[PDB]
Symmetry: D2
Subunit: 333 residues, 4 copies
């Protein structure tokens, strides 16, 4: 029902658009990207190495990007404050360029007529939300919000179930993550982050990530009780969270499995999945869950110290959550 504008037609921008058209929860009416012109957008949206060809029609007609017969107004503005979102009917704007993540920068979309902005990435100051964890805390006074990161969306739902049932005293996370657009094909310049400049296809690359610490923001009781790091590995998509945590209350591995499965079939259905199958990363290709607990992969040392594994299609799950968040925001109008 709510009309949406998308700033940045990258992996997230394009997949959020796909999710929107596939679920029908929101209607994309405008897209802005100064580097990708209309004809090129058709091509980028139609063919996707990771998620396959688009199911439907996508064409350029009279200057509009038409997807399944729905005309989308296209903008090519480098400065957010200059995008005429209002004229195009875009009430909500998905900020997915990665360069306007602060309240001040993301707020520029409001100058163009947009009513609310959803940053598809962590924000230093904008309120962060995670579907299934604290999205109910959202309220109409918030005009600029964040949907956190893919990794936080994977860890948070799992951590909530674990903390709620056994209490997390402290935890350390490692995410074995697929390569992303910020990486390089061969050893190249990355002045601010040297390891990230090394060839992505040749290396296992350690990288910092505030995704675990961020959980404390969506689950206040866990603030200061979690942190971790990441390892970028040579796969194009799908990542996995490895959470090592200490529990305050005794928890046999089978008890953990029971509560997680119960959560996946109830309140967290569609967000937190559960499996006992002998899965591998590709099995989650295009899987829309934010997190899928892998029962057989985890291992416990004792009743108070365990390692829990959860899979996440870092592109598809997150993109669907952005749409879900906007759908929820719309119901609160």
């Amino acid at each position: 029902k709510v009309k949406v504008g998308v700033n940045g037609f990258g992996r997230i921008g394009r997949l959020v658009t796909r999710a929107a058209f596939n679920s029908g929860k929101v209607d994309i009416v405008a897209i802005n990207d100064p580097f990708i012109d209309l004809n090129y957008m058709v091509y980028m949206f139609q063919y996707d190495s990771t998620h396959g060809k688009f199911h439907g029609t996508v064409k350029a007609e009279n200057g509009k990007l038409v997807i399944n017969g729905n005309p989308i107004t296209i903008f090519q503005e480098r400065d957010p404050s200059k995008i005429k979102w209002g004229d195009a009917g875009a009430e909500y704007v998905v900020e997915s360029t990665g360069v306007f993540t602060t309240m001040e920068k993301a707020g520029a979309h409001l100058q163009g007529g947009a009513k609310r902005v959803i940053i598809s990435a962590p924000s230093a100051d904008a309120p962060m939300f995670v579907m299934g964890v604290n999205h109910e805390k959202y309220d109409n006074s918030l005009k600029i919000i964040s949907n956190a990161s893919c990794t936080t969306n994977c860890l948070a739902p799992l951590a909530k179930v674990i903390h709620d049932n056994f209490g997390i005293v402290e935890g350390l996370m490692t995410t074995v993550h697929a390569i992303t657009a910020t990486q390089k094909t061969v050893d190249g310049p990355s002045g601010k982050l040297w390891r990230d400049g090394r060839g992505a296809l040749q290396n296992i690359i350690p990288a910092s990530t505030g995704a675990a610490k961020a959980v404390g923001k969506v689950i206040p009781e866990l603030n200061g009780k979690l942190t971790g790091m990441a390892f970028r590995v040579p796969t194009a998509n799908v990542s996995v969270v490895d959470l090592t945590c200490r529990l305050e209350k005794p928890a046999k591995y089978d008890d953990i499995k029971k509560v997680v499965k119960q959560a996946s079939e109830g309140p967290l259905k569609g967000i937190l999945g559960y499996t006992e199958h002998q899965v591998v990363s590709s099995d989650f290709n295009s899987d829309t869950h934010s997190s899928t607990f892998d029962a057989g992969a985890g291992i416990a040392l004792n009743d108070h110290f365990v390692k829990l594994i959860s899979w996440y299609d870092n592109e598809f799950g997150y993109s669907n959550r952005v749409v879900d968040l906007m759908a929820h925001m719309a119901s609160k109008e």
Copy 2:
């Protein structure tokens, strides 16, 4: 000094051979592999996708494999008990086929004339040793021993320094490991381990490993205090250990760095390395250390709960340790 025979001229078999001829600490005099004839061995030893062309000379001459002018007797037996090690003068036999890891199966080499057998992998019952951690425990009454696994050789040295200084109350390990010969190029049969049959190039594959629990064998005080699992990723070589542990005594990260660096420059020099550089996996290709602590990659939640990272060339480091172990055994004869 001690004359050695190699059973299974594979990644470890060939690299152990390369390591032996480089240091000259032991003399390879015989090799057995029914799946690689003499002329084929020349080619397999001469060219290596991972470690480059052999630096010396290798040729087939008078029915022997000649490396740097040293003739090696070649056997082609599937049955270990049928190998005439004695006639070839092989005193120690490196059992690197991966299919004769028990005392009973590995002991077959003794029937052929060998005096001792070193299993290049963990064993269900053969005494396990890790250079720099418990190799001094070895004695002449042991005719069949194990050099553990690559992963245990990476974790044990680090765990030793951490435990000796701060005391490890409990720890959970994850190793992001390069693919190996047991994996498949595309989804194929692996009846005993379903996940391992899935395409190695396309997937992050969780796998069980007793490497962490095994540390309890080489470091008795840590028995039952460590365990973990592995993730196989799409890289041809070099792996990394991710140890999440709770310490008894307060250990600020800088103090952890200090003690590990001190150990690397002293009693564990050559076994445990230390670096503060912004390294990635490829920086350790052909690195002979058993474990190299990555100061910048690790992260601490507090003074008693930290995640430690250590790199290891799973093929090269381990192969050099097999040679070091035999050299130590020889010194006690």
Copy 3:
């Protein structure tokens, strides 16, 4: 309509099965494979790293593999002559193990009750067929036939159109091919073909192939006028043919494009595809065509000397052709 048995539940065996159910052209009633028991077959068929999770249902029940509610009888015989195909009612058998490609070896299935056998690979003596090129040459006297190779199925349709219209004087083909089950994850034993044993993830590997010369089997006028070779590269699926040929009747590139496009919309529809889009290999993942002409990738030096490019999903296209061939055979009974 015709009831089919599948010997060898591998990439081709499983995808032929998937194709049979998805297309519904033939009915799979039996499967034989000594290295994959019933429960494992459910897993291998349900999850696929390359083509995604099966969209229907698959379960084990009372010793049967039930796909979309259809019970499949399961055999576990290593000896083809011992498989009781008749017990299951299987009339045609798809021989896809890769080890019974001769008439004598493939014919073993007739002893168990099967009526005809289709070898999913080239055969030294079994008549070979390529859908769209010479499948009409099949007749009821042939009880054992071959569906050629994936590469021949890609080149033959294209060669047919080019020869029919311009006449091929001579041609040399190179196929840049995805890795297959015959390759190794790391440098390993491959006594008959040394290059094939080298690490598949690390290398571009030259390989011989009789696929181009084999076009003559199905297009006799091209006997002695074609041959080529292959390069195996680090991709899990989808390959490409690169045909460099000299024409008898000079033709502008646009005219070549015209006749190929015409063919793709006519008699060769579904077999020979045509595209002018800026495609890459992934765009053909799960594409059922035997060959798809890439108009923009090819290049002509002049009107009589050109390089033509055609894509093929080596797993999916071929598997669908096997089903198409059996449907055609059934119509001739």
Copy 4:
């Protein structure tokens, strides 16, 4: 003996520097690059995912980059005309940024005191040279020249031998090429060349290249007789040329092997290599040849139509040729 400056410390810039320091042919005295500060240069030079760690010494000292005890002046100018090469003592300047390939743009280095400029890439108007093919045509009146491309440096030597001996009527080339810095890790923007923006790890990507046509420049008699294209594949380094050509005079494949072997042992030694071994791409990692003929990989259809295969480390071979060219230029001062 000649003092050299390097503009652009990328793959080629850094590798040309490595080659310069291990031949004494030339001495690097200055380097310019605005996107890589001094401390970062130390890191990028000392570690290399493809060619391993630098085995000599490298450190930042007193504002200069010191390699093997030799101080190098470091500049950070974005405008070539502003670099003070003259005062730094740089007589020749290697232009390896890839953005100043024309006579006009490359000449900017002359304004700063440089005497001659060697463009490490094809130039639209600067005279191009290929060592072993037409470098004897260079003379000291030329202040700005081009060393062509890696691909042209691979094809030219081979084409010369084939043409000189049998005469090339016409030919079409395909190069299966490793990924480069211009590619993307995941589907991203490449507005000018859409296929090049597609994920480099996931795809075989067809791409245009004028390397074959350029051979007609270094070998005038082949002007307009050669052209071709490329396929980018998921490997980090080492590429291969696939030349399909028509010969004027008859030539059995063994005759071709004979003349290529002869050329490699004489006039083209070190430039054109020859092998009959069962090699794969990795065997050419860090190989300094411009082209290595693979006897066993090629195939002939008849005495006048053949497919010839030649390997080339696109980074290492070329970088060494740049140094060899400057050494030649110096001998002609």
